[PDB]
Amino acid sequence: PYNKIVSHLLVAEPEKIYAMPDPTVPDSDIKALTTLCDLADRELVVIIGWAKHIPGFSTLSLADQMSLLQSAWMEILILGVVYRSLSFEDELVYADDYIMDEDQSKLAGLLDLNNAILQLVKKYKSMKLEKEEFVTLKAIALANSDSMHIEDVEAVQKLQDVLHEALQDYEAGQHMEDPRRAGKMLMTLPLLRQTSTKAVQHFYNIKLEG
Amino acid sequence: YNKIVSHLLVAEPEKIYAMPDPTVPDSDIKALTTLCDLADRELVVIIGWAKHIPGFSTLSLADQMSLLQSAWMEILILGVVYRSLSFEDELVYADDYIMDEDQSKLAGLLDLNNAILQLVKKYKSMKLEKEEFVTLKAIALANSDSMHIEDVEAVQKLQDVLHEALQDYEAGQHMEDPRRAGKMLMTLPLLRQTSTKAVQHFYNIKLE
Ligand SMILES: CC/C(=C(\c1ccc(O)cc1)c1ccc(OCCN(C)C)cc1)c1ccccc1
Numbered sequence: 001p002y003n004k005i006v007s008h009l010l011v012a013e014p015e016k017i018y019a020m021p022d023p024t025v026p027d028s029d030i031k032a033l034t035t036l037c038d039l040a041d042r043e044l045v046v047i048i049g050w051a052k053h054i055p056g057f058s059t060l061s062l063a064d065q066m067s068l069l070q071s072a073w074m075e076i077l078i079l080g081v082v083y084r085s086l087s088f089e090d091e092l093v094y095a096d097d098y099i100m101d102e103d104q105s106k107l108a109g110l111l112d113l114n115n116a117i118l119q120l121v122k123k124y125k126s127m128k129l130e131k132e133e134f135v136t137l138k139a140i141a142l143a144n145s146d147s148m149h150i151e152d153v154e155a156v157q158k159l160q161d162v163l164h165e166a167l168q169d170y171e172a173g174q175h176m177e178d179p180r181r182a183g184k185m186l187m188t189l190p191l192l193r194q195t196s197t198k199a200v201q202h203f204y205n206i207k208l209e210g
Numbered sequence: 211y212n213k214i215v216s217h218l219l220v221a222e223p224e225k226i227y228a229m230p231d232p233t234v235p236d237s238d239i240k241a242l243t244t245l246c247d248l249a250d251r252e253l254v255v256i257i258g259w260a261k262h263i264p265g266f267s268t269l270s271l272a273d274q275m276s277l278l279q280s281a282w283m284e285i286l287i288l289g290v291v292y293r294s295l296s297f298e299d300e301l302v303y304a305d306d307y308i309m310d311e312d313q314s315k316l317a318g319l320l321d322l323n324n325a326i327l328q329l330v331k332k333y334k335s336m337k338l339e340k341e342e343f344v345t346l347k348a349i350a351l352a353n354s355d356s357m358h359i360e361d362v363e364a365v366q367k368l369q370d371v372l373h374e375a376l377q378d379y380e381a382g383q384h385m386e387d388p389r390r391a392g393k394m395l396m397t398l399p400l401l402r403q404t405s406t407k408a409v410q411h412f413y414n415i416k417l418e
């Protein structure tokens with residue numbers, strides 16, 4: 001119906017970012033990896049631009065604004081893809097010009113991993129996830145990254161609170177069929193965190209192995 | 211008073227002890243062994259405790275085990291975490307085994323324990339109650355996100371039931387915060403992460 005925060009967040013939303021493949025080089029695990037690497041690099045600058053638009057976010061200390069972006073960037077990237085693929089089935093809308101099926105992923109050796117995000121994508125799909133929910137869960141994810149390098153903990157909390165409140169409230173007017181929808185959304189965050197940490201690790205392994 | 215929560219409480223297992231076998235002088239191995247032996251004896255208990263969770267038993271033995279399979283670490287972690295609330299910078303795994311910053315460094319569990327302590331840091335901040343504990347334990351169990359389940363609906367129903375119990379509990383004894391249940395739900399990620407880091411670390415011993 002109308003929530004201050006949710007609307008703000010829809011607006012603060014970033015524009016369509018396209019992967020931009022290299023047509024002259026062959027499709028290998030090094031290509032796909034390289035393709036995603038930069039795709040994320042670009043998004044990371046995109047996200048830092050965005051976070052400033054997160055109501056109450058710019059007010060925290062800089063050292064703390066960095067602490068969170070430091071921790072929650074991967075979940076943000078991830079929830080991102082997870083969203084792009086809701087209207088699709090069994091594949092990943094990493095980029096609107098970059099989609100991967102079971103076979104493109106088998107070639108990239110990201111089967112295990114992608115079969116993980118397919119799962120995450122399944123839940124949200126079975127909940128009929130809404131754009132307004134994405135943006136909110138996304139902001140929450142950030143204000144809930146639990147960095148250990150926090151200096152002013154009472155502030156992080158008020159930021160968490162402000163965003164949590166917007167969720168309960170938006171879910172309150174748009175879905176009275178489910179007096180427990182917000183909290184349900186919230187329970188999908190762990191998997192988000194699980195996937196992201198899985199992602200981070202595969203990366204530290206590819207870097208170890210080469 | 212909420213029925214489901216009264217149950218979970220009553221179900222709450224009896225105290226367990228690590229019993230730092232009067233055998234080997236303190237050392238990485240001794241330490242790691244003590245925990246290995248306690249976790250196992252706890253795991254058994256957990257299995258039994260599980261039978262009481264409302265609606266848990268009705269599940270096919272296949273699912274029941276798929277959940278336990280995935281959540282047993284969060285459960286173990288949550289325990290020591292609740293056990294450690296009333297303390298400072300120390301992790302209580304058992305009344306006979308209490309790890310302080312140094313004993314940790316000795317076991318190499320500095321990083322692991324240090325994240326676990328972070329978990330406690332938050333629960334202490336919001337004065338976690340035994341009631342809230344027993345309930346999250348059950349919730350974490352059914353919200354374990356296992357990839358290989360048969361009956362998705364029945365499981366979902368179990369998460370709703372327990373979720374209802376939590377939102378309800380907060381609604382009665384904690385009217386001062388309408389977002390409390392949700393905030394408890396928000397501590398689940400960390401628990402997940404920590405339980406994960408904890409597990410990958412165990413397997414990482416002599417492998418690649
Ligand atoms: C899951 C795909 C992915 C990345 C990704 C995820 C979501 C998204 O929207 C875009 C990309 C990925 C790849 C590279 C990367 O690099 C960050 C480091 N920069 C500074 C070089 C981050 C994420 C990746 C992670 C680990 C190993 C290999 C690939």
Ligand SMILES: CC/C(=C(\c1ccc(O)cc1)c1ccc(OCCN(C)C)cc1)c1ccccc1
Binds near residue numbers: 247286
């Ligand atoms: C966090 C301490 C811990 C365990 C633990 C946690 C909570 C608790 O109440 C009791 C113990 C731990 C240690 C061993 C273990 O083994 C399970 C596998 N069995 C079948 C051999 C599980 C957890 C541990 C985890 C990873 C590496 C080293 C130690």
